[PDB]
Design a protein around this nucleic acid. Structure first.
Ligand SMILES: [Mg+2]
Ligand SMILES: [Mg+2]
Ligand SMILES: [Mg+2]
Ligand SMILES: [Mg+2]
Ligand SMILES: [Mg+2]
Ligand SMILES: [Mg+2]
Ligand SMILES: [Mg+2]
Ligand SMILES: [Mg+2]
Ligand SMILES: [Mg+2]
Ligand SMILES: [Mg+2]
Ligand SMILES: [Mg+2]
Ligand SMILES: [Mg+2]
Ligand SMILES: [Mg+2]
Ligand SMILES: [Mg+2]
Ligand SMILES: [Mg+2]
Ligand SMILES: [Mg+2]
Ligand SMILES: [Mg+2]
Ligand SMILES: [Mg+2]
Ligand SMILES: [Mg+2]
Ligand SMILES: [Mg+2]
Ligand SMILES: [Mg+2]
Ligand SMILES: [Mg+2]
Ligand SMILES: [Mg+2]
Ligand SMILES: [Mg+2]
Ligand SMILES: [Mg+2]
Ligand SMILES: [Mg+2]
Ligand SMILES: [Mg+2]
Ligand SMILES: [Mg+2]
Ligand SMILES: [Mg+2]
Ligand SMILES: [Mg+2]
Ligand SMILES: [Mg+2]
Ligand SMILES: [Mg+2]
Ligand SMILES: [Mg+2]
Ligand SMILES: [Mg+2]
Ligand SMILES: [Mg+2]
Ligand SMILES: [Mg+2]
Ligand SMILES: [Mg+2]
Ligand SMILES: [Mg+2]
Ligand SMILES: [Mg+2]
Lengths: 79, 50, 64, 96
RNA sequence: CCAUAGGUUAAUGAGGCGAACCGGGGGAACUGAAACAUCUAAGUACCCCGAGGAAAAGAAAUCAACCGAGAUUCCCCCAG
RNA sequence: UUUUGUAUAAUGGGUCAGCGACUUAUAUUCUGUAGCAAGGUUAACCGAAUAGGGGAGCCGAAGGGAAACCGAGUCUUAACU
RNA sequence: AGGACCGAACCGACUAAUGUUGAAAAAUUAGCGGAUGACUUGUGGCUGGGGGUGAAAGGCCAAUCAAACCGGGAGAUAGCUGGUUCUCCCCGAAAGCUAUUUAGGUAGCGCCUCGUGAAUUCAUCUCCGGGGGUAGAGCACUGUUUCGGCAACAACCCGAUGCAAACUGCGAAUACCGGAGAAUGUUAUCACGGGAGACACACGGCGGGUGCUAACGUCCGUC
RNA sequence: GUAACGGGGCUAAACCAUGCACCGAAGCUGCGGCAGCGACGCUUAUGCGUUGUUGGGUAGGGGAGCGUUCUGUAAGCCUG
RNA sequence: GUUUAUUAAAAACACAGCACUGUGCAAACACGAAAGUGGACGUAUACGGUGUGACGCCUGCCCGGUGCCGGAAGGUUAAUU
RNA sequence: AAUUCCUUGUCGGGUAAGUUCCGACCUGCACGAAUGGCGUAAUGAUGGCCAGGCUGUCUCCACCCGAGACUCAGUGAAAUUGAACUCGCUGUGAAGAUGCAGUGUACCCGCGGCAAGACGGAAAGACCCCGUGAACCUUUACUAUAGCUUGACACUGAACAU
RNA sequence: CUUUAAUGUUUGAUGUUCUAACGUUGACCCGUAAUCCGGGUUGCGGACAGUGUCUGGUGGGUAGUUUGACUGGGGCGGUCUCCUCCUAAAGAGUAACGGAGGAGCACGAAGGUUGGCUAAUCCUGGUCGGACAUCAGGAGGUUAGUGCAAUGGCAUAAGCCAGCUUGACUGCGAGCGUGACGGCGCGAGCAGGUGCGAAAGCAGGUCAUAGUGAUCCGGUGGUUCUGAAUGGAAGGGCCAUC
């Protein structure tokens, strides 16, 4: 009674954990809702509407911490 | 609802047009705002919006 | 007796350079005002059959 | 095509109709031909009597198939600018 | 009144059987649509009348497409 | 036999002998095999009838486009991308 | 005189027993009701099926009736039940997901088989690079909870003790993703194409919701 | 109906710890034999000897076969 | 008195009586595509339908809803033009 | 109460004792006036209760006469039936065992008797659920339709008034 | 010629009367020593009635069907699509009639950009001002705020204020995520043109995740795509859209 329902999939997480093939624009992190769980940085950025961490130019993924008070900050150099 | 589907028209002699909605209930003033007209390939004034 | 082709189906498909049939996208002929022009701008072009249900298509059009 | 019980695939997908009703009377000649058009001058017809067009046809294109060799002069027909070349490459001739 | 109607006679012909095929009059439902009304089954089954060795059809108020073809009927294609 | 599971107290059979159920026609798609090959093949019909004749026609050598059209390109678009 | 009384024939059928592979597909026996009446009976006739007939039970219409019997449409349909016949050899599932007037049926995917291609593909162990908020712990935060410290009986706050799936200022094992390496593995791996079956699972271990940390209970994950 | 060691029966035939011996399966080994894939020897069409390894199996997929009736090979062969 | 022939004989059906209602006769109604026929060679003290069910004392209040009866002035309104 | 759930209501009568019965009360779960209310002589193979007579209905059976039953001679069925070398107990087990484990017991075969088990025989459960099954039935379910009925035109004309 | 009235006329509306269709289950005659039927005569009725086609109403009298599923048996109740959290075992994903709460929209500004700003709460002091209106100072530090649930996020603010605007643009799209599929989501960059800014640059709707409906059949605008002898047209396609 009045108890049930539920959203659905909405994966939103790391799909390009650490270094990877890193194509012109994979994802490496689609953890929506977030902006601080994974901050836009490095050769890549994007951070689309749903905050999905873009991932520009091809290369390797990094996953840093640089910046006052934690602050993840995903960056991707060239591999 | 209360939001009618409004349609913006080009001031140009072309039939091209845009589409959206408006709250006529409180905005009985026909809207205009200028948009791109593919036909004339030039940004012009678009009108009609209850 | 010659196999009859599923008319309704042969009106939404069209064999391509090979196996594929390529069809028409849906959600592009009704209530559009509230649809991203982009979304639709990516619906106008034709698209091949998903290769998953394609098998069925190549059954409704025996003479395709 | 009885997709379980749900809406079939040949259903959820729109239908883009319309049929030439003219392409049926339009043939497609190939460069490999002509050399077998029985003699010279590839008349608007000829190929018909040369079994390679169709008594119903009315329009046709020369098109390149990768052959020509013998000099031929197509008549009462069309041809691609890529064929009206290889055709002349062997002393051809366009009607029009 | 005429005249018809009706009556008698005679000469002819019909009647009833029939297997299929044939023309015509009337005409289902199960079934399929994974339900069911449109639709399908099917102008089928079935009933009725009529005729022949065949029946029916047939010498364009037909097609064609600006070239032309030339009654009807049956076969193969066109084409699922 | 059906079941997650049956010695099962779940189904079927008294026994024997004979009969008893994936066929056939046309179509379409693969696989194998044979013929020929950018060509392969005839239908009806004729018939000196399994020949031979008949290529009406079907399939393939060209595709893209909704089509007009164009064509190893073509659509999309003003468009060069 | 009387749809009057008692009572045989005659008509009927309230009770019990017996019969129940009967003597009998409704009877026998002992009682029982009407018996000049809407009585009872012979003979012949008329009502025909969605129709008849009916002092009305859906009763009767040939041992048949909420639509007779015979023949035909007809091999109706049957996602259901049953049954499916000689031998050997290789491989070998599923009882899941997602849809479905769908739930014991189906269809795409997944798992089987067979064929054709493909790169040092795929697996384990080692080392490197990764994000992680579970277990646990903790109580700043969200709530909750004690005990002290002032409150014309107590918040707040201070210190001291705990509790949490929807608490977290902490935080594993580990799983997973990627990179490189050796060995081993009769390509194990991927794509495509011919044939599927299967979408009732059961128990035991571990982590759990539900249940009574009940059930050979129920519902997921995983082996 | 003994019915809460399977029974008999056991004070150790119970239990704790230590250690050795043995029994025990279609597991593993040995010997002989069969089929599939890989290697050798070889010898090489062929082809086998040795060796490595594989061979539970419902739905179901794949590959090989046996036999029954009728046609040709049949005016042949077997046959009183 | 009647009834479930073959598990129910009854408190069930039937009945005389009552009431409502239809019917002016080519009656209403019913069988029948129709002709025709029953009603009835009857004619409102007659015939059909429905409910109640001897007889006695009785049978109250509600017409809002539904049906039926009457009115139809006006509003809406088919084919047709 | 053929209507009352509470309900064996409460009271009275009958009994030695009465969830029934009869007479009352009224708190009518949820009577009620022609889908008639309340009475009613007579009638009834009608429902309930009481009594007198009567008795094997019973306490509690006993004997007796016949038809079978049993024996002999003649004739001669049936359902059922996977195969049988067809014991008890306790446990096990697809969860209530002749067939499994353990144990106990038991010379082989008939005849007459009884029915506790063979989840005995009999009928592809009638209850229950399921099937995008069936049939009749109802209705302001839907869609149609005979019949009834409305008007227009046709068969269908001549005049006058307004 | 109109705005309007007698004459004729045409025509509709009823209302009368007539006969001659039409009816007669009145009376005779003949067929005929018949009750049917037919013809004739007469009476009554009379363009009515009745019938055919069409048409509105009525129509369980009859007919064909429909009348969902999940469900700790069925029914009743509840549920059926979408979003948020827990269950979910630290990648994704996972069930129950498990525990909780929301969506079916709202904004021409609540969008874009440029420039600027920063809370809640308490303490102290202050006209009417008190529990809390506005003012001042201090502590405090995302405990505020966020159009609406929840989770995540937000100070370089995604929070607040103002100026200028319409990028809530058109065509495309490297490449990815997520689905059995139909789909759905993210998207740098390219071309055309815009807006804001001195400029670098930002802008393809809102802090993000709900605010939704496939196909068919059509409706509206556009288009030299098609258009059955030809030119048109109807109709069809295409793009936009209801
Ligand atoms: Mg030809
Ligand atoms: Mg059907
Ligand atoms: Mg001419
Ligand atoms: Mg079972
Ligand atoms: Mg058995
Ligand atoms: Mg046999
Ligand atoms: Mg009497
Ligand atoms: Mg007697
Ligand atoms: Mg008597
Ligand atoms: Mg008789
Ligand atoms: Mg009978
Ligand atoms: Mg049939
Ligand atoms: Mg059958
Ligand atoms: Mg559906
Ligand atoms: Mg914990
Ligand atoms: Mg299923
Ligand atoms: Mg299942
Ligand atoms: Mg399971
Ligand atoms: Mg279980
Ligand atoms: Mg051994
Ligand atoms: Mg095997
Ligand atoms: Mg009597
Ligand atoms: Mg009786
Ligand atoms: Mg009565
Ligand atoms: Mg009465
Ligand atoms: Mg009354
Ligand atoms: Mg009493
Ligand atoms: Mg009553
Ligand atoms: Mg004897
Ligand atoms: Mg037992
Ligand atoms: Mg006995
Ligand atoms: Mg039994
Ligand atoms: Mg059964
Ligand atoms: Mg009905
Ligand atoms: Mg039907
Ligand atoms: Mg159900
Ligand atoms: Mg997870
Ligand atoms: Mg995990
Ligand atoms: Mg928002």
């Amino acid at each position: 009674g009045g108890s049930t329902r539920n959203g659905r999939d909405s994966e939103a997480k790391r799909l390009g954990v650490k270094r990877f093939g890193g194509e012109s624009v994979l994802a490496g992190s689609i953890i929506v809702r977030q902006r601080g769980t994974k901050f836009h940085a490095g050769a890549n950025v994007g951070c689309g509407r749903d905050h999905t961490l873009f991932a520009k130019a091809d290369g390797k993924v990094k996953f840093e911490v640089k910046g006052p008070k934690n602050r993840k900050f995903i960056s991707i150099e060239a591999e | 609802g209360i939001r009618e589907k409004i349609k913006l028209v080009s001031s140009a002699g072309t039939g091209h047009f845009y589409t959206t909605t408006k709250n006529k209930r409180t905005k009985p003033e026909k809207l205009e705002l200028k948009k791109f007209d593919p036909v004339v390939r030039q940004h012009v004034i678009y009108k009609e919006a209850k | 007796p010659k196999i009859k082709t599923v008319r309704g189906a042969a009106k939404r498909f069209k064999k391509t350079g090979k196996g594929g049939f390529k069809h028409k996208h849906a959600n592009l002929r009704h209530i559009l005002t509230k649809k991203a022009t982009k979304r639709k701008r990516h619906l106008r072009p034709k698209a091949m059959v998903s290769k998953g249900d394609l098998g069925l298509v190549i059954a409704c059009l025996p003479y395709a | 095509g009885f997709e379980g019980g749900q809406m079939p695939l040949y259903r959820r997908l729109p239908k883009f109709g319309f049929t030439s009703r003219k392409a049926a009377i339009t043939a497609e000649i190939r460069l490999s031909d002509l050399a077998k058009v029985e003699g010279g001058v590839v008349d608007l017809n000829t190929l018909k009597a040369a079994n390679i067009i169709g008594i119903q046809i009315e329009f046709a294109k020369v098109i390149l198939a990768g052959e020509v060799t013998t000099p031929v002069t197509v008549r009462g027909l069309r041809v691609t600018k890529g064929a009206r070349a290889a055709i002349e490459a062997a002393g051809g001739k366009i009607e029009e």
